[PDB]
Amino acid sequence: KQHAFTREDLLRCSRGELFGPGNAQLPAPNMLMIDRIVHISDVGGKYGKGELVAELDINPDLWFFACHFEGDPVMPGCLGLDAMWQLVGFYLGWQGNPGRGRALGSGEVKFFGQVLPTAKKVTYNIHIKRTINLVLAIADGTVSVDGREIYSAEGLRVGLFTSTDSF
Amino acid sequence: TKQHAFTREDLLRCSRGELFGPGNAQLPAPNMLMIDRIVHISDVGGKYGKGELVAELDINPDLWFFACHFEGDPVMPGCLGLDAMWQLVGFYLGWQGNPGRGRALGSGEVKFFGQVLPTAKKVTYNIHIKRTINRSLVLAIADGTVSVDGREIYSAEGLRVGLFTSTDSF
Numbered sequence: 001k002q003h004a005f006t007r008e009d010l011l012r013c014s015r016g017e018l019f020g021p022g023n024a025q026l027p028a029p030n031m032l033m034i035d036r037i038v039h040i041s042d043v044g045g046k047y048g049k050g051e052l053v054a055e056l057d058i059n060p061d062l063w064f065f066a067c068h069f070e071g072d073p074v075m076p077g078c079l080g081l082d083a084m085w086q087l088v089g090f091y092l093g094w095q096g097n098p099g100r101g102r103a104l105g106s107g108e109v110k111f112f113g114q115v116l117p118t119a120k121k122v123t124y125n126i127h128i129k130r131t132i133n134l135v136l137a138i139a140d141g142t143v144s145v146d147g148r149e150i151y152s153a154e155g156l157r158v159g160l161f162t163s164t165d166s167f
Numbered sequence: 168t169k170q171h172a173f174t175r176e177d178l179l180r181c182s183r184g185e186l187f188g189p190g191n192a193q194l195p196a197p198n199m200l201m202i203d204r205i206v207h208i209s210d211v212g213g214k215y216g217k218g219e220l221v222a223e224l225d226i227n228p229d230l231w232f233f234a235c236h237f238e239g240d241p242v243m244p245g246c247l248g249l250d251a252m253w254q255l256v257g258f259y260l261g262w263q264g265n266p267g268r269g270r271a272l273g274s275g276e277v278k279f280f281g282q283v284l285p286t287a288k289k290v291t292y293n294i295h296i297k298r299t300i301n302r303s304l305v306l307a308i309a310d311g312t313v314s315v316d317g318r319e320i321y322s323a324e325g326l327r328v329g330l331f332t333s334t335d336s337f
């Protein structure tokens with residue numbers, strides 16, 4: 001029903017309190033790689049099967065700049081990638097499906113730019129390609145920094161797992 | 168290229184730029200460093216006859232990510248096991264004696280089909296080098312798998328990492 005979420009909405013999700021116990025949670029800091037969801041719907045997008053647009057605000061004091069790497073700070077790609085998985089999981093829970101979320105993998109992933117600590121904002125664009133009903137979603141995603149496209153991922157997969165679902 | 172294993176302190180020295188020198192490959196420091204030790208690294212043998220790395224990360228409930236991922240449902244993030252494999256392929260490139268800073272370039276298929284719970288003992292990475300290209304930029308292509316206490320849980324085909332004597336373009 002709701003098409004945008006604030007950081008507090010996301011934190012409430014991370015405690016299990018948005019979609020309920022046993023259903024999809026975002027991670028909490030410092031794994032949470034999203035500050036807000038600017039748009040989420042289940043129509044339109046590249047494939048007509050939905051879209052998310054999310055943001056993460058950047059400043060030099062974010063933890064990962066210190067350790068990755070000393071004398072050469074850059075946001076880790078894996079974390080931008082996980083953002084995209086986090087977002088596809090959120091989608092599944094937001095649609096009203098039950099169960100806990102797990103990334104199942106992707107096809108191609110490409111990194112061709114970087115998020116430096118002089119950046120202002122990272123934006124994720126996720127396009128849902130298919131939902132299969134175990135319940136799972138396939139999407140493409142890109143990551144951008146102050147307007148500039150830097151990562152891409154094809155065929156991101158996230159599944160949801162109930163009481164009766166095992167890895 | 169002489170040394171075929173590294174301790175955690177070797178890896179921490181690498182992370183400060185002090186194993187391979189300034190401007191060459193570094194591992195990340197904690198809490199992004201996802202390896203405790205490299206048990207075997209060589210540039211012959213492996214699946215493809217072009218080299219192999221075997222590395223370990225020790226698991227205990229205390230590791231930071233278990234608290235936040237997720238509350239009431241701790242599990243190691245897959246992205247971090249993935250990054251371990253990139254981190255390792257970068258180390259290989261520096262260990263071969265090439266210059267420049269490392270950047271993950273991407274991969275083909277990745278599959279997650281198991282998980283690391285905080286009751287696990289040890290995660291093990293096995294990386295097989297498929298190709299190193301030295302033609303203009305220096306880069307590596309490898310397959311990898313991740314295992315937890317003997318059980319294979321992730322796979323990655325076509326991991327790519329490059330070295331850059333000049334990243335300024337990105």
Ligand SMILES: CC(C)CNC(=O)COCc1cc(-c2cccs2)on1
Nearest residue numbers: 077110111112113114270271272337
């Ligand atoms: C898909 C093929 C073209 C790979 N792409 C390239 O050749 C372009 O350069 C790679 C690059 C990567 C990064 C980052 C890596 C990790 C965090 S940021 O910053 N520049």
